[PDB]
């Protein structure tokens, strides 16, 4: 009963980070070594666990969040970070237990003329709490004057397309990101390694 990690890492399309996708992984055998024992991931950072020993671990649930951001923003997918992504789109908690895995996806997610389908929230009144998702589209009042349903200077549509192009510099290329959250609940484990 293998965990469906392939459906996560090899999905044809990924979510925009402001509307990041969560998949619950439950009641299965998890082979993390297929992920770690590869040359595929420029980022593979674990918090609270060792990447070599993931197949020894047992959890009640594992959550797989996934989305696309720019290369220069992958560092924000970490406990304690700040920036447009950590602040307004996807926030990890200080006490995060899990792994952040990322890889360049210029070959799939860029387009000549720009791929506009991947968005991020550029304006927000306050920072997100950990694992909060905000998909609202209210006009953002950047100044003292109320916007009253009209966009203009200081009255902004809050989401922005990246517009990935294959000629972008690597820091501006799309990266697919998968965050595995390991749920630590005192209850029967349903996700264990092969062993």
């Amino acid at each position, epitope marked *: 009963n293998l965990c469906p990690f392939g459906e996560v890492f090899n999905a044809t399309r990924f979510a925009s980070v402001y509307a990041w996708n969560r998949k619950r992984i439950s009641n299965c055998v998890a082979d993390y070594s297929v992920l*770690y*024992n590869s*040359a595929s*991931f*420029s*980022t*593979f950072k674990c918090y609270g666990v060792s990447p070599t020993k993931l197949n020894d671990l047992c959890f009640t649930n594992v959550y797989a969040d996934s989305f696309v951001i720019r290369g220069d923003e992958v*560092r924000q997918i970490a406990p304690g970070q700040t920036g447009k992504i950590a602040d307004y789109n996807y926030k990890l908690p200080d006490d995060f237990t899990g792994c952040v895995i990322a890889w*360049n996806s210029n070959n799939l997610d860029s387009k000549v003329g720009g791929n506009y389908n991947y968005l991020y929230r550029l304006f927000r009144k306050s920072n997100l709490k950990p694992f909060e998702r905000d998909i609202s589209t209210e006009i953002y009042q950047a100044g003292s004057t109320p916007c009253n349903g009209v966009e203009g200077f200081n009255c902004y549509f809050p989401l922005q397309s990246y517009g990935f192009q294959p000629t972008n510099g*690597v820091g501006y290329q799309p990266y697919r990101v998968v965050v595995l959250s390991f749920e630590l609940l005192h209850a029967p484990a349903t996700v264990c390694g092969p062993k």
Partner: nanobody, 121 residues
Framework: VQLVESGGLVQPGGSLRLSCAAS????????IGWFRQAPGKEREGVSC????????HFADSVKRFTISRDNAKNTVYLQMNSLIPEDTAVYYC???????????????????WGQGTQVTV
């Protein structure tokens, strides 16, 4: 959290040895790459050692160079032999926590950078 390089004049045919020693963290899980930049040229990848210990060489030139790591001393070494004047550059070590066999040739993907040491031939 820091990377410190050491080991840089010398003239053709000689050998030099560069070391990248880290402080504030353990380098076992990181890939370490060496990049160099000569004046008036682009920054270029030299060699990389993955967390698994595997070696990759990027520049067709150096394919004369060897790379190794001492996890115990938390250091990485680059051995340069048959030095030429075209090898004159500032050398940088960089660290990145990727998958076990990952070793990337593109310097933009590395998180941590050393101070850089000049090698002149």
């Amino acid at each position: 959290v820091q990377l410190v390089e050491s080991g840089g004049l010398v003239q053709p045919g000689g050998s030099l040895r560069l070391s990248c020693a880290a402080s504030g963290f353990t380098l076992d899980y990181y890939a370490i790459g060496w990049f160099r930049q000569a004046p008036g040229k682009e920054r270029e990848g030299v060699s990389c050692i993955s967390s698994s210990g595997g070696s990759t060489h990027f520049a067709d030139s150096v394919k004369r160079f060897t790379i190794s790591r001492d996890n115990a001393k938390n250091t990485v070494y680059l051995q340069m032999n048959s030095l030429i004047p075209e090898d004159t550059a500032v050398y940088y070590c960089a660290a990145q926590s990727g998958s076990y066999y990952w070793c990337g040739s593109d310097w933009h993907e590395y998180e941590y950078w050393g101070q850089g040491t000049q090698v002149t031939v």
